[PDB]
Symmetry: C2
Subunit: 280 residues, 2 copies
């Protein structure tokens, strides 16, 4: 048996980590894995879904990174969606506990006395209503959870405390740090929407004279291997990538083998893994 | 057109970085890329070479991580070898300047007054003759260059100054740091055979109270993106992965399109990129 994985590119550590876990899980089922990337083409994801028709894999896991209209997920091969975008029940999908993990973690920071929390990885200019009402999106749902924690504490979350470097990379984490510091903002804590951004932020904060955690608490999201070896080691939301991969692979193989139940949504659990970049 | 890339797994940053560069290069030629991994199978590389017969790619770049007898590289599809192992002229191959870059860098350390240099990522118990006489191997040729720099300075390199954590990962860099420190060794400098090991070493040195660079100079190899964001930022040998990928892709596409000259060996150039983890 042969499974396909479609991802944008390998530029950030999470793609490597997810792919490796899918490969391990797939091997437990005696399936191989081939990887197609789609970030190198305009309308790239659609082209990869078409290319899958002529590849050898028996079915596909697709990690989407943007919204799709309620057609692309209508394919003739077995297909499981991963990522934070809605499949509208066209296929099984696996996702992370984006709202809950961010609400929990922002609440922990607030309850530990860190009242001013910047968020790296989202555009505040999209407005509070967009985030409050969102039903899909990586950035959107993670912001939503952060906003809910503020609301639970009787405080309005401020769009001016969201900083975006553009993409979700270490270089964007550096850019978001500069944007925030250049605006004179010196917060109690920063939550980054992935570990790549947090690793960039740890670097640029230290370069510009800010001590972590003594001046600013820093939290990431994913618990990629890199987070263990950072200096200081990185506190991060672990969305249980082992279980996430296991569900994606089990669901896809079930469909390849004829499983015909209604399409499902699985949401992984999470753990806040505390390391040296916070002092909660 | 469709190119295949076979690599062991994505567990360390270099595999991501090389794959992404191959994808960019391939896209410039209007070729896609599919990735097969082989580390998840016993005799894995041989199985991937066989699987390639039934995949859709028009030709393969294979990144080998161990020696092959002077049969595996005899295939019916176009094939270019990458990595530090000998193809014996069966196929075109692209490699890094393993001896020269390590000799240059070890000489820079010695000439700057850092006389005691540990090497992380090789087994000293293999003996000096094995390293002096080697004609292939990542570990072997990099050690060979380090030994030549010592010899140029009239000093015998010591096998007891090589530390291996097993594999070439960040976790092995942590293990090699513990092995070295537990033996009471406090060197002037450490050269790690890849950046993943150096990033682990930067972490474990700091955890155990060793300042980089004030107590120990630290150098890596690859100049993966991570090295820019380390704390302290990582001095590293850059083996010109852009040119390495460009040559692998150009050679493979040439063979797919009928190029019939003798098989070639390309060796990339190198630059020592100095950052905060050294003070040369």
């Amino acid at each position: 048996g042969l499974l396909g994985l479609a991802i944008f590119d390998f530029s950030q550590p999470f793609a490597s980590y997810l792919a490796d876990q899918i490969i391990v899980c797939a091997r437990e089922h005696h399936y191989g894995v081939i990887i197609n990337t789609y970030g190198q083409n305009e309308h790239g994801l659609a082209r990869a879904m078409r290319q899958a028709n002529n590849l050898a894999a028996d079915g596909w896991i697709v990690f989407a990174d943007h919204a799709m209209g309620q057609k692309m997920l209508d394919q003739s091969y077995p297909l499981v969606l991963t990522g934070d975008w809605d499949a509208y029940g066209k296929v099984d999908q696996v996702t992370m506990p984006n709202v809950e993990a961010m609400r929990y973690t922002t609440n922990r920071l607030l309850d530990s006395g860190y009242r001013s929390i910047a968020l790296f990885g989202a555009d505040g200019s999209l407005g509070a209503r967009h985030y409050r009402q969102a039903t899909e999106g990586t950035q959107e749902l993670r912001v939503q959870g952060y906003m809910q924690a503020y609301e639970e504490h009787g405080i309005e979350a401020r769009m001016d405390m969201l900083f975006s470097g553009g993409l979700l990379t270490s270089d964007s984490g550096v850019r978001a740090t500069n944007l925030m510091m250049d605006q004179g903002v010196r917060p109690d804590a920063i939550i980054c929407l992935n570990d790549a951004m947090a690793l960039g932020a740890l670097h640029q904060l230290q370069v510009r004279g800010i001590r972590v955690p003594d001046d600013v608490q820093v939290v990431g999201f994913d618990n990629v291997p890199e987070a263990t070896y950072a200096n200081p080691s990185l506190t991060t939301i672990d969305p249980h990538i082992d279980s996430y991969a296991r569900h994606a692979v089990d669901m896809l193989i079930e469909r390849i083998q004829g499983y015909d139940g209604a399409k499902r949504v699985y949401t992984s659990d999470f753990t806040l893994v505390e390391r040296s970049s916070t002092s909660l």
